[PDB]
Amino acid sequence: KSEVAHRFKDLGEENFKALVLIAFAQYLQQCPFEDHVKLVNEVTEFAKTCVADESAENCDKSLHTLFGDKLCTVATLRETYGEMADCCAKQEPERNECFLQHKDDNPNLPRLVRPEVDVMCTAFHDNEETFLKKYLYEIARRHPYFYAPELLFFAKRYKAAFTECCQAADKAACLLPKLDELRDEGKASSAKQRLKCASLQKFGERAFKAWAVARLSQRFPKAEFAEVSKLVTDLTKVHTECCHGDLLECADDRADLAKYICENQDSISSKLKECCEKPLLEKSHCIAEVENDEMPADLPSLAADFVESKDVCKNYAEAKDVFLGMFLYEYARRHPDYSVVLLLRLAKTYETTLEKCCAAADPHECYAKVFDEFKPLVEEPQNLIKQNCELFEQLGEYKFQNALLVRYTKKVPQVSTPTLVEVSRNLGKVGSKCCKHPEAKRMPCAEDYLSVVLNQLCVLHEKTPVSDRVTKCCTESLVNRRPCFSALEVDETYVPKEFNAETFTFHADICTLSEKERQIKKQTALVELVKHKPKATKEQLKAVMDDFAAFVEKCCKADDKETCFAEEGKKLVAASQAAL
């Protein structure tokens, strides 16, 4: 039998063209469009001829082996410059990896450009433009890991948009505010994902199970332990693939799944009616995270004292894996009000401890209310979301979200100025999209979201390696990430302590060079870090700065581009470090 045409024989053809492009274009990610597309055109071909006939010569390729051996070819030797030190070696296994499966990450390479003001409205005489070319863009750029089928789901929702409102609104208004929102949602999942791989095989594959047995049980909390373990065992497989390189199996798989999940509906989690009256595609992004859990649970199931007031320390605990699984899951069930990332810590203070004392010198009290020394590691969140959600509350949406900069730029003052200001504001954006939301529903979002961002931080910067600390809180644990960065004072380690850096204040009539405070502030904020990186930290001082660099606007007119550039440099560096 073959692989090629067989994949062709489920996900149809558009979505075969539709994968094999993004596939080939996360992969090599700098080579121009047509090179990539000729090569698709050809895969796309061929497939049809093992469609005709399995038995035809060389169908017998193991999928990759085609790509591998029709990729290096004229994609690559037209692509001759110096980072992919070719990787088609002794026709191997060790192809996918060494280079074809090495995706430069966040910050990959050229990028600045895009579409613009009026013209991108272009479902007239090509969707090769926009619709198609939301992959040499919305998937070459900064997303070599982005989850295939979800791009096919986020493809229609670039298409469908155009496919109504170029219309009466000149595309103007009735269009591009579905091109505001759904750009953060491109970043969101593409970033809500690098995690799910980072769990997967930049960290042990075993972890993920515990991730998802924690999670699918937080939403399907009557799903018997049987059935979460044919949803998280079935989801690893998917996610592993979309991570390990080979998508296609993926996209087929989340219906080789959803057409189990959603034929079984009632034995699993009631609330997946809606998205089962939804064309495949959108099934897997209702069920995918917009899944209002069916709290509260299975049961009364009164209490969880099988893990507790008993004597089966080991006796009923010679299944390592499933014992923990049934802690996790059953603990998971009654706690939509605690974040997975937390509960995963309670699932390592069972596991350790119960091993601390299933062994020696009885008796039971060792594990006697672990429930009552867990409780440190259940207070710090419940608490932290105070000096998350108050410094923000009555003290600033987009004003002092640049507090968490001051915090981070201090305690960890060697990550790259951007790579602060991507995070600094991003993990900023928890204050907004979660405090204004409170209850239980608060924390599950907000240790978790924070948890994603710290990962952006980690995955971002291996590339150049900086703060041995950041090295430490990334590596040492996944599960202990967000009391790590947190549990870090000002690393007085510093010096270099750069003085006086005038590839500094580019001024340049920024004031209406640039618009939308998202663009205005970001610079005004991009001032912050480098106004401390000289002088690591100071008390009151440092806001007599960002107004002495908020005149950065109002000396910017009447014959400018040299107004605020002589002026500042005296009056913002003169105003700097050690005296003022």
Curated annotation (Swiss-Prot):
<feature type="glycosylation site" description="N-linked (Glc) (glycation) lysine; in vitro">
    <location>
        <position position="570"/>
    </location>
</feature>
<feature type="site" description="Not glycated">
    <location>
        <position position="497"/>
    </location>
</feature>
<feature type="disulfide bond">
    <location>
        <begin position="458"/>
        <end position="474"/>
    </location>
</feature>
<keyword id="KW-0677">Repeat</keyword>
<feature type="site" description="Not glycated">
    <location>
        <position position="571"/>
    </location>
</feature>
<keyword id="KW-0732">Signal</keyword>
<dbReference type="GO" id="GO:0005794">
    <property type="term" value="C:Golgi apparatus"/>
</dbReference>
<dbReference type="GO" id="GO:0072732">
    <property type="term" value="P:cellular response to calcium ion starvation"/>
</dbReference>
<keyword id="KW-0488">Methylation</keyword>
<feature type="glycosylation site" description="N-linked (GlcNAc...) asparagine; in variant Redhill">
    <location>
        <position position="315"/>
    </location>
</feature>
<feature type="site" description="Not glycated">
    <location>
        <position position="516"/>
    </location>
</feature>
<feature type="disulfide bond">
    <location>
        <begin position="357"/>
        <end position="366"/>
    </location>
</feature>
<feature type="binding site">
    <location>
        <position position="256"/>
    </location>
    <ligand>
        <name>Ca(2+) 2</name>
    </ligand>
</feature>
<dbReference type="GO" id="GO:0005615">
    <property type="term" value="C:extracellular space"/>
</dbReference>
<dbReference type="GO" id="GO:0015643">
    <property type="term" value="F:toxic substance binding"/>
</dbReference>
<feature type="glycosylation site" description="N-linked (Glc) (glycation) lysine">
    <location>
        <position position="522"/>
    </location>
</feature>
<dbReference type="GO" id="GO:1903981">
    <property type="term" value="F:enterobactin binding"/>
</dbReference>
<feature type="disulfide bond">
    <location>
        <begin position="473"/>
        <end position="484"/>
    </location>
</feature>
<keyword id="KW-0446">Lipid-binding</keyword>
<feature type="glycosylation site" description="N-linked (Glc) (glycation) lysine; in vitro">
    <location>
        <position position="196"/>
    </location>
</feature>
<feature type="site" description="Not glycated">
    <location>
        <position position="178"/>
    </location>
</feature>
<feature type="site" description="Not glycated">
    <location>
        <position position="399"/>
    </location>
</feature>
<comment type="function">
    <text>Binds water, Ca(2+), Na(+), K(+), fatty acids, hormones, bilirubin and drugs. Its main function is the regulation of the colloidal osmotic pressure of blood. Major zinc transporter in plasma, typically binds about 80% of all plasma zinc. Major calcium and magnesium transporter in plasma, binds approximately 45% of circulating calcium and magnesium in plasma. Potentially has more than two calcium-binding sites and might additionally bind calcium in a non-specific manner.</text>
</comment>
<dbReference type="GO" id="GO:0051902">
    <property type="term" value="P:negative regulation of mitochondrial depolarization"/>
</dbReference>
<feature type="binding site">
    <location>
        <position position="3"/>
    </location>
    <ligand>
        <name>Ca(2+) 1</name>
    </ligand>
</feature>
<feature type="modified residue" description="Phosphoserine; by FAM20C">
    <location>
        <position position="62"/>
    </location>
</feature>
<feature type="disulfide bond">
    <location>
        <begin position="242"/>
        <end position="250"/>
    </location>
</feature>
<feature type="site" description="Not glycated">
    <location>
        <position position="521"/>
    </location>
</feature>
<keyword id="KW-0165">Cleavage on pair of basic residues</keyword>
<feature type="modified residue" description="Phosphoserine">
    <location>
        <position position="416"/>
    </location>
</feature>
<feature type="glycosylation site" description="N-linked (Glc) (glycation) lysine">
    <location>
        <position position="278"/>
    </location>
</feature>
<feature type="binding site">
    <location>
        <position position="246"/>
    </location>
    <ligand>
        <name>Zn(2+)</name>
    </ligand>
</feature>
<feature type="binding site">
    <location>
        <position position="64"/>
    </location>
    <ligand>
        <name>Zn(2+)</name>
    </ligand>
</feature>
<feature type="disulfide bond">
    <location>
        <begin position="165"/>
        <end position="174"/>
    </location>
</feature>
<feature type="disulfide bond">
    <location>
        <begin position="121"/>
        <end position="166"/>
    </location>
</feature>
<dbReference type="GO" id="GO:0005504">
    <property type="term" value="F:fatty acid binding"/>
</dbReference>
<feature type="modified residue" description="N6-succinyllysine">
    <location>
        <position position="433"/>
    </location>
</feature>
<feature type="site" description="Not glycated">
    <location>
        <position position="61"/>
    </location>
</feature>
<feature type="modified residue" description="Phosphothreonine; by FAM20C">
    <location>
        <position position="80"/>
    </location>
</feature>
<feature type="disulfide bond">
    <location>
        <begin position="197"/>
        <end position="243"/>
    </location>
</feature>
<feature type="site" description="Not glycated">
    <location>
        <position position="1"/>
    </location>
</feature>
<feature type="disulfide bond">
    <location>
        <begin position="262"/>
        <end position="276"/>
    </location>
</feature>
